[PDB]
Amino acid sequence: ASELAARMTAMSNATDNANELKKTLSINYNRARQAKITGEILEIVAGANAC
Amino acid sequence: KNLGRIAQIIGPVLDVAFPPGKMPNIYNALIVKGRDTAGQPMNVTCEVQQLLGNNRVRAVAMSATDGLTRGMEVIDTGAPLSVPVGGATLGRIFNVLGEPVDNLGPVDTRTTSPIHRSAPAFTQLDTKLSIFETGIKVVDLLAPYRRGGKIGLFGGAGVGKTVLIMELINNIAKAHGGVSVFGGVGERTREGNDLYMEMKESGVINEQNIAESKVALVYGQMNEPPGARMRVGLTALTMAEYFRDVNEQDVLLFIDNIFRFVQAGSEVSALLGRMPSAVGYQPTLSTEMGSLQERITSTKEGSITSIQAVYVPADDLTDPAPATTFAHLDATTVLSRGLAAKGIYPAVDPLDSTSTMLQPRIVGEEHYEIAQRVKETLQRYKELQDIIAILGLDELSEEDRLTVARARKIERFLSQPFFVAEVFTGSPGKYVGLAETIRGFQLILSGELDSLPEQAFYLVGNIDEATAKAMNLEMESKL
Amino acid sequence: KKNLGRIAQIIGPVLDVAFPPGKMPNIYNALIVKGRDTAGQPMNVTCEVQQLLGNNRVRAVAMSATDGLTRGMEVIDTGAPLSVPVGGATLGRIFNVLGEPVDNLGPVDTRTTSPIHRSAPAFTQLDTKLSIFETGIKVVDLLAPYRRGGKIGLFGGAGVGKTVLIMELINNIAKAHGGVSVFGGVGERTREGNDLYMEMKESGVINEQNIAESKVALVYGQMNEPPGARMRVGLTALTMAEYFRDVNEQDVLLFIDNIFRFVQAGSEVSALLGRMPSAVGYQPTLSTEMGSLQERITSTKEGSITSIQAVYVPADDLTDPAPATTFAHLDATTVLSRGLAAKGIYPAVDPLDSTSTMLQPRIVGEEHYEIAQRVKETLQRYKELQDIIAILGLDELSEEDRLTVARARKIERFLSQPFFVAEVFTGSPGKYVGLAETIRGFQLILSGELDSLPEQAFYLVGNIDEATAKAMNLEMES
Amino acid sequence: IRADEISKIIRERIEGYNREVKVVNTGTVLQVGDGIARIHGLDEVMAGELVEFEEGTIGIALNLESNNVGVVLMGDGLMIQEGSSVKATGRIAQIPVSEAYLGRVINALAKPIDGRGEITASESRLIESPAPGIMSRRSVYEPLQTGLIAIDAMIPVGRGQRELIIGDRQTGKTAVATDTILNQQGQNVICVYVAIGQKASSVAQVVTNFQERGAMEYTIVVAETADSPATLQYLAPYTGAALAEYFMYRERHTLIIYDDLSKQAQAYRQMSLLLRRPPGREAYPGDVFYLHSRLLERAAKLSSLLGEGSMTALPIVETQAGDVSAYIPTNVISITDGQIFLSADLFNAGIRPAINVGISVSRVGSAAQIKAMKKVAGKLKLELAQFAELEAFAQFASDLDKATQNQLARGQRLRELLKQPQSAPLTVEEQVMTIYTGTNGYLDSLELDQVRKYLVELRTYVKTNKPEFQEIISSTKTFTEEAEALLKEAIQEQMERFLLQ
Amino acid sequence: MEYTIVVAETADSPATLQYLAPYTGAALAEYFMYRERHTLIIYDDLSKQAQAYRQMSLLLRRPPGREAYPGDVFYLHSRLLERAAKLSSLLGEGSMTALPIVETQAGDVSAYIPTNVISITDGQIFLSADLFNAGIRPAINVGIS
Ligand SMILES: Nc1ncnc2c1ncn2[C@@H]1O[C@H](COP(=O)(O)OP(=O)(O)OP(=O)(O)O)[C@@H](O)[C@H]1O
Ligand SMILES: Nc1ncnc2c1ncn2[C@@H]1O[C@H](COP(=O)(O)OP(=O)(O)OP(=O)(O)O)[C@@H](O)[C@H]1O
Ligand SMILES: Nc1ncnc2c1ncn2[C@@H]1O[C@H](COP(=O)(O)OP(=O)(O)O)[C@@H](O)[C@H]1O
């Protein structure tokens, strides 16, 4: 019983640690995708309008 | 006349002017000649893509920008460039414009096909579907080629693609009695040189007596201008084209790299007054791959089987050049940095690599079940592996704990050594037969050889040799 | 005396000036413009050429606020590059982007002046000795030793205590060694510029009366300044520094902060120069301008110009080119990771990238080299375990890895140097530590002498004996 | 001695001068802005001619239009009047070359920035001499030595092979470059440390270390001040390449160290941008690929027909945050002969050098390293790759198999063999010693963290007791039974010596 | 209303006017602080001024940089936030404390405009949506503030 209670608190902290980690990583992904494709767009538009 | 001036030269882009009497058509070979830094009679060949009004035209040069100076003569040949093709044009290595760069005797230049030509319509395409076995384990199991198809080496950052081409050429050039041709298109020159040395070694070039060489090498340098590199593929393709219609034999193409060609086209298109595109490339990428992968088609007149290396930059797929190259391929082999990191070679993730010629009825409905079972347990392992990396295999439940070790053996078993890669491995490779392959996998996926250690499957050609190495490993576990 | 004439175009900050067709001015030289104003037509409009642009026309950069002037103003070519007062005239004087004393003191004597920029010093005129001096901030003195006469890079984003770390460093080395101590402010918060100026006045390293006894030349350039002014104040301050290393022949302390604002001014002026952009936004010439501002800092054969440069890493982006040039261009990278300040350590310095080529056995002693090693191996291992310990919790490690995490966080909180100037910000009157600390706190941590006192028991205390006394106090309070 | 003899040489230089009929192309300079000179007129100018100004800050004509010519300022021309008669030099960026360069810090305009005095030089090496020919060249069949252990162990460098060092900053890239330079002390190897776009204090430090190690008797350092104009900062690797061509073309095989190449791409980017030649992706001009292609393809191995020398290349490129998907480290990995990494993790975690062979690779293989190390440990690269994966796999270490326990402790001790101290360039025979010590499982039973001490004891013991081993094998390059016997013999002896104690 | 002079243009206003508005607020605040008195200016919100100036720049076709914002924006904000200080009794020791409101996005303090105005101010003041939906009103996070 204590074994599968320690496993339960292991998972009950691991799920929430995974949730805050995916929150941070999702924000990191959104910022990274935003930054990459904005740099892409402004770069290609610089190359296109530089004529 | 047709003699014009070169008004602007910026990189390998050359703005040629002309009197209003003549302004030539596109794709035509132009040759400024007779000048160099040494007063030499050095010529430069340059073809035209965009003609920018006032009887003037911006061209791309297939040799270096040095030498020629603005306000210089230029002699257009009144025609698109023509490549010397023929059985006399086997053996020797030659230029994009066709000049034999083997520095011994030039081939007889009498039959020159134009480098830009029509693509064969599908009424001429041999719709005959066929199967090809090439002796490399994971390929002839899971990505079986079409003897007639188009074959893709989606490679990563210099991992196993060129050595794969060397191995595969070594295994099948002797096999295919028809003509064969390597196109070195922006290939690294010392490894094209090593390939040429291996053709001299294995006698497929037959260095002492040529034109019996069923292989024919044409190469274009990395260090050559992108004006050269954006047509060297067309040169090799036209040699194969001549052999596919005039000779109409079984013809084998091994160009490397097609993405070199793409990058050269992008490279000049930025210069020759054109907009960019999505990341990487020119806006003409799709039509470039259209010209290529519509001209490399096994015809009802004559078969062809073109393999080609595709280096993706950043080792991905969302990249636009492989986003159209997959769409123009039919036998796709996608390599992986991960499987190269674990040494497994060829580092193809079998998940990504597929083929149209993996239909059950056309591979054998038991061979297909072999392929499905391996792809199933393999993909499930590639799913499971991060959960492993956080919760332990010994925790990860048994009905999948068997399959993770099973497919973990599977991939390393289908890592098999090559007769050239022995310089990188230590043991000379093996030419594996597909019956031996499906046999060993019918052991592993079933779970007959679950008793073996996993590293007994490491880098082993045949499953009986894997049992032999397994007995050796057990013996050394005693000793 | 030289070509008078007319500005033909003004475009905000940048300006395009036509001239007599005969003689155009130099490139990189200066020239004032008289222009106009409300009251009087002052020579406040100093200007500086950038690009001779056809039709006897030069495109030039401004130095001050440039409204009110117009096309066709009476431009005056001064011919020479921008001169600037040097000498004891500098000492203590808080002068400005063109050298004029804006400290509400006397106009300094122009008997000794120098042009704004010059060539790079010579391959031979570089020094040879890998000079090292400590500061008193223990994380630096452990794992990022400071090439004195070389370049000392301060990285980090904003709100991470970089200017405050500079205030602490100058708070030490103002009355510590070194001769003239030239602070320059490139784009500084001007209230903080006058703040540390008042800290110099109170601390007395600068002089109220007889100011020519200062060994301090605080030539700030405020953040408010136009982009030409921000683009030039770095060259002013380094002109002072090289002047002292060649004429005082002195080891010059060269606090500058932060040259990202300088190169951003360069980017901003290029965007109106019409030079095409570069990586993500900046000028195409960021490489060469950072190369100028670096290569004209050297430890000479006689003047070890120790430069303490800050770089505002924008939005904590190390792969940005404005870092990516500088910490190729400097010796002691010190990146200040923001997340450590989120945790609450002050200063907030990682060990992993904060580094030096001074950290060599044949420079710091093999003992101090392996000291820094045995720190760094453990903390890098802690990061490699950190990114998988935060997910799925603490005790899934080995006993060994658990102890290693404990000891790594021991070193981490142990490097929480309480700052002597930060008492007015936090409350704790900071402490000074040295090389006996540098060996011994490490030694007790890594040997396992201190191995039961908690993570607070070396928190915000420099001296390891002070950590022991703090441990005694917190164990007493129970 | 001055003004007392030189008057006759003054007469010699004056009398007998040219008074030539040299018709020249001459340009009225139109648009100088920020390191470039868009010049009016100047029609028949070869793209790549140096163009002489009023000043003497000469310039290369890169681009050229129907009206203007894109000309750079090699040497920043700080005062150039509009309309100045800026004529070309006619010749194309030629470079004077001699063996008397061997030690002088030299600038990209072939100029001694050593303080040692000017160099007499005869030939005029082109700046764009092309690659050596395809058929003309042999495979890289001959070893070239690292001095660092793990590279020659798993990922070999060869004379003519152009391995690419890569990695983040501050991780010992320049350090391992100088180490594999001053490894070459008796191998008849010219080194050309082309320093590009970094601290002159750093290049002074490395020439100080070279003056210490004596290696500056034969090496040629092309410095590049970060204040040097970006035209010069990208030009200098071409100068170093042609200078190494000058020695490879005789017979003399050589090595080159670009340091770095990423600043070369950046400086060249700056020049192309001010030239208004439009950028490709990541704001770079597209043909940094072409630039580095022309660079590295000028580095190869000669064959017997033309001199059988070599120009093995080490272009370091800098990649931020450990990326590979940066644009220049995406071009150069395709155009190099395989790449080696210096992960910040592996450096700061003690593996110094930090070549994690999981991502590191040398793509010509054992044929460019010695047959002894071949026959010993060809397989050890893949064995250590498996050990790296399985050690990542042995995170789940609850009940390891006994065989995988042997394998993990084995590759553990192997990785501990691949630790080496700062600038201790081991004899290649000593690398054979430690590689056989690893591959023959003597160290398996031994203490796992005292393997460094076991190795230094063993190498001292063999270098004293049986130094005939290293010379017979260095004369045969082959791991024979004599090598085996001497090895296992001193292995028993020093294993006893370090067991007791 | 005697303590304030409310400056209000809204999102209907052209981005130029929204760009000039806080400059005008700072100007009249300079007149009032300059006339011996303490004053307090509430930029609200300055990120909207960044967006407006970015639009004005793009319609001016000036090539934007970091995060598609122009490189000017740091000097831009330095203008209207370095005009806000406390003078000394040399000129009447008025003070111009300032609260430039910057509404960040998802807590991305490492986004260009927020890290920019942090690089010019006298420190952060936090406000997490999490502490706001955690009932703690106001929601200032004192560990980072
Ligand atoms: N070392 C420190 N000691 C005490 N407080 C600190 C420290 N570092 C940061 N803080 C707190 O954080 C606030 C802002 O951080 P900090 O001053 O480090 O940024 P900064 O120095 O302005 O950075 P930069 O100078 O590079 O712009 C300070 O006002 C202070 O309240
Ligand atoms: N085998 C080794 N043992 C210990 N330290 C090493 C070793 N190899 C390299 N280093 C260290 O790496 C540090 C950085 O050297 P180096 O400048 O070559 O790195 P880098 O990445 O090239 O930096 P930069 O690119 O800025 O020159 C040096 O201080 C050196 O001591
Ligand atoms: N597991 C492996 N098996 C075979 N070769 C490998 C392996 N790992 C690395 N290599 C190296 O990779 C190189 C081939 O890479 P490849 O992609 O074929 O060519 P390139 O690197 O020129 O694109 C070989 O020369 C070899 O040294």
Q: Tell me B145's DSSP state.
A: B
Distances in whole angstroms, Cα of residue C87 to Cα of each of B324, C216, C239, C240, D347: 67, 11, 11, 8, 46
Q: In this structure, is the dihedral angle defined by the CA atoms of residues C241, C243, C245 and C251, taken in order, positive or negative?
A: negative
Has domain B358-477 been given CATH number 1.10.1140.10? Answer: yes
A21 neighbourhood in chain C, CB within 8 Å = 390-391
Specify the ligand 1 atom closest to the Cα of C426.
4
Compute the distance between CA of residue D498 and CA of residue D153 in angstroms, rounded to an integer. Answer: 25
Chain B nearest-CA distance from A23, in A, is: 18
- End-to-end Cα separation, chain C, in angstroms: 82
Taking the centre of ligand 2 as the mean of its atom positions, its distance from the CA of residue D170, in whole angstroms, is 6
C158 neighbourhood in chain E, CB within 8 Å = 115-116, 118-119
Question: Considering the domain boundaries, does residue D14 fall inside one?
Answer: no
- CATH code for the domain of D423: 1.20.150.20
Specify the ligand 3 atom closest to the Cα of B344.
1
Q: Do C264 and E122 touch (CB under 8 A)?
A: no
Residue closest via CA to ligand 2's atom 13 equals: D172
Name the experiment that determined this structure. Answer: cryo-EM
- End-to-end Cα separation, chain E, in angstroms: 30
Q: Are B258 and B185 in contact (CB under 8 A)?
A: yes
Q: Has C23 been annotated as catalytic?
A: no
Q: Choose among C422, C430, C436, C439: nearest CA to C462.
A: C430
Instruction: Using a CB–CB cutoff of 8 Å, tell me whether C392 touches chain B.
Output: yes
Q: Has D91 been annotated as catalytic?
A: no
State both tokens at C328. Answer: 């190729």
Of the listed ligands, the closest to the CA of B345 is: 3
CATH of B81-357, one of 2.60.120.620, 3.40.50.1000, 3.40.50.300, 1.10.287.1120: 3.40.50.300
Q: Are C203 and C175 in contact (CB under 8 A)?
A: yes
Question: Considering the domain boundaries, does residue D104 fall inside one?
Answer: yes
Residues 6+ apart with CB under 8 A from C136: C172, C432, C433, C434
Chains that touch D (3 or more CB pairs under 8 A): A, B, C
Closest residue of chain E to A44, computed from CA coordinates: E63
The annotation status of C179 as a binding-site residue, yes or no, is no
Q: Is C211 in the pocket of ligand 1 (CB under 6 A)?
A: no
CATH of domain C359-478: 1.10.1140.10
Mutation target among C129, C287, C373, C382 for the D interface, most CBs of D within 10 A? C287
Q: What is the DSSP string of D428-443?
A: HHHHHHHHHHHHTTHH
Beta-bridge mates of residue C306: C253
Residues D391 and D456 both lie in one domain: yes
| Domain end marker among D48, D73, D91 | D91
CATH 2.40.10.170 residue ranges in chain C?
Answer: 1-81
CATH 3.40.50.300 residue ranges in chain B?
Answer: 81-357
Residues 250-289 of chain B with CB under 8 A from chain A are 270, 273, 275-279
CA C314 to chain centre: 15
Closest residue of chain A to C275, computed from CA coordinates: A50
Dihedrals phi, psi of D265, to nearest 5 degrees: -65, -40
CATH 1.10.1140.10 residue ranges in chain B?
Answer: 358-477
3-state secondary structure of E20: helix
A47 neighbourhood in chain B, CB within 8 Å = 270, 275-276
Residues with CB under 6 A from ligand 3: B 155, 158-164, 188, 191, 340, 343, 345, 421, 424; D 361, 363, 365
Catalytic site residue from B167, B187, B267, B288: B187
Chain C nearest-CA distance from E1, in A, is: 30
Q: Are D76 and D68 in contact (CB under 8 A)?
A: no
State both tokens at D254. Answer: 């050589």
Compute the distance between CA of residue C223 and CA of residue C187 in angstroms, rounded to an integer. Answer: 4
Compute the distance between CA of residue B448 and CA of residue B443 in angstroms, rounded to an integer. Answer: 5
Resolution of the structure in the document, Å: 4.5
Mutation target among D38, D66, D134 for the B interface, most CBs of B within 10 A? D134
- CATH code for the domain of D145: 3.40.50.300
Has domain C1-81 been given CATH number 2.40.10.170? Answer: yes
D282 neighbourhood in chain A, CB within 8 Å = 43
Distances in whole angstroms, Cα of residue B451 to Cα of each of B447, B479, D387, D404, D407: 8, 19, 21, 14, 18
Q: Choose among B57, B76, B78, B41: nearest CA to B7.
A: B57
Q: Do E82 and C314 touch (CB under 8 A)?
A: no
| Domain end marker among D369, D398, D431 | D369
Compute the distance between CA of residue D499 and CA of residue D492 in angstroms, rounded to an integer. Answer: 10
What is the assigned CATH class of domain B1-80?
mainly beta
Q: Are D369 and D156 in contact (CB under 8 A)?
A: yes
Residues D392 and D472 both lie in one domain: yes
Question: Which amino acid belongs to residue D414?
Answer: L
Instruction: Using a CB–CB cutoff of 8 Å, tell me whether A46 touches chain D.
Output: yes
State both tokens at D198. Answer: 């970094």
Chain D nearest-CA distance from A23, in A, is: 22
Q: Tokens 């960044």 identify what position?
A: E50
Residues D281 and D314 both lie in one domain: yes
Number of domains in chain D: 3
Residues D126 and D256 both lie in one domain: yes
Q: What is the DSSP string of E52-116?
A: HHHHHHHHTT----GGGS-TTHHHHHHHHHHS--B--TTTT--BEEE--B---STT-TTSHHHHH
Residues 6+ apart with CB under 8 A from D346: D354, D355, D356
Report the half-sphere exposure of D433 (CA within 13 A, side-chain side).
Answer: 27
CA C197 to chain centre: 16
Of the listed ligands, the closest to the CA of B153 is: 3
D79 neighbourhood in chain C, CB within 8 Å = 26-27, 29
Q: Is C441 in the pocket of ligand 1 (CB under 6 A)?
A: no
What is the assigned CATH class of domain C82-358?
alpha beta
Question: Considering the domain boundaries, does residue D9 fall inside one?
Answer: no
Residues belonging to chain C: 478
Residues D385 and D486 both lie in one domain: yes
Instruction: Using a CB–CB cutoff of 8 Å, tell me whether C390 touches chain A.
Output: yes
Instruction: Using a CB–CB cutoff of 8 Å, tell me whether D286 touches chain A.
Output: no
Dihedrals phi, psi of D413, to nearest 5 degrees: -60, -30
Compute the distance between CA of residue D335 and CA of residue E88 in angstroms, rounded to an integer. Answer: 64
H-state helical runs in C123-279: 138-143, 162-173, 190-203, 227-243, 259-273
Distances in whole angstroms, Cα of residue D83 to Cα of each of A13, C54, D63, D328, E4: 76, 10, 19, 38, 61
Beta-bridge mates of residue D71: D61
Residues D173 and D201 both lie in one domain: yes
Compute the distance between CA of residue C351 and CA of residue B382 in angstroms, rounded to an integer. Answer: 35
CATH 1.10.1140.10 residue ranges in chain C?
Answer: 359-478
CATH 3.40.50.300 residue ranges in chain C?
Answer: 82-358
Cis previous bond, D187, omega within 30? no
Q: Choose among C257, C256, C289: nearest CA to C270.
A: C289
Dihedrals phi, psi of B410, to nearest 5 degrees: -60, -50
B285 neighbourhood in chain A, CB within 8 Å = none
Q: What is the DSSP string of D365-421?
A: GGGGS-HHHHHHHSTHHHHHHHHHHHHHHTTS-SS--HHHHHHHHHHHHHHHHT---
Say whether the D–E interface has 3 or more Cβ pairs within 8 Å: no
Of the listed ligands, the closest to the CA of C377 is: 2
3-state secondary structure of D105: coil
Provide the residue range defining the domain that includes D191: 92-369
Residues D266 and D377 both lie in one domain: no
CA D215 to chain centre: 15
Q: Tell me C245's DSSP state.
A: I
Residues D133 and D218 both lie in one domain: yes
Q: Is D146 in the pocket of ligand 2 (CB under 6 A)?
A: no
Q: Give the CA angle between residues C393, C398, C400 to the nearest 5°.
A: 120
Say whether the B–E interface has 3 or more Cβ pairs within 8 Å: no
Question: Considering the domain boundaries, does residue D2 fall inside one?
Answer: no
Q: Choose among B378, B406, B400: nearest CA to B387.
A: B400
Question: Considering the domain boundaries, does residue D383 fall inside one?
Answer: yes
Q: Is D240 in the pocket of ligand 2 (CB under 6 A)?
A: no
| Domain end marker among D45, D61, D91 | D91
Q: Do C391 and A17 touch (CB under 8 A)?
A: yes
Mutation target among B387, B388, B390, B393 for the C interface, most CBs of C within 10 A? B390
Catalytic site residue from D294, D363, D410, D459: D363
State both tokens at D124. Answer: 């005029």
Q: Do C271 and E116 touch (CB under 8 A)?
A: no
Compute the distance between CA of residue B189 and CA of residue B173 in angstroms, rounded to an integer. Answer: 21
Q: Are C312 and C186 in contact (CB under 8 A)?
A: no
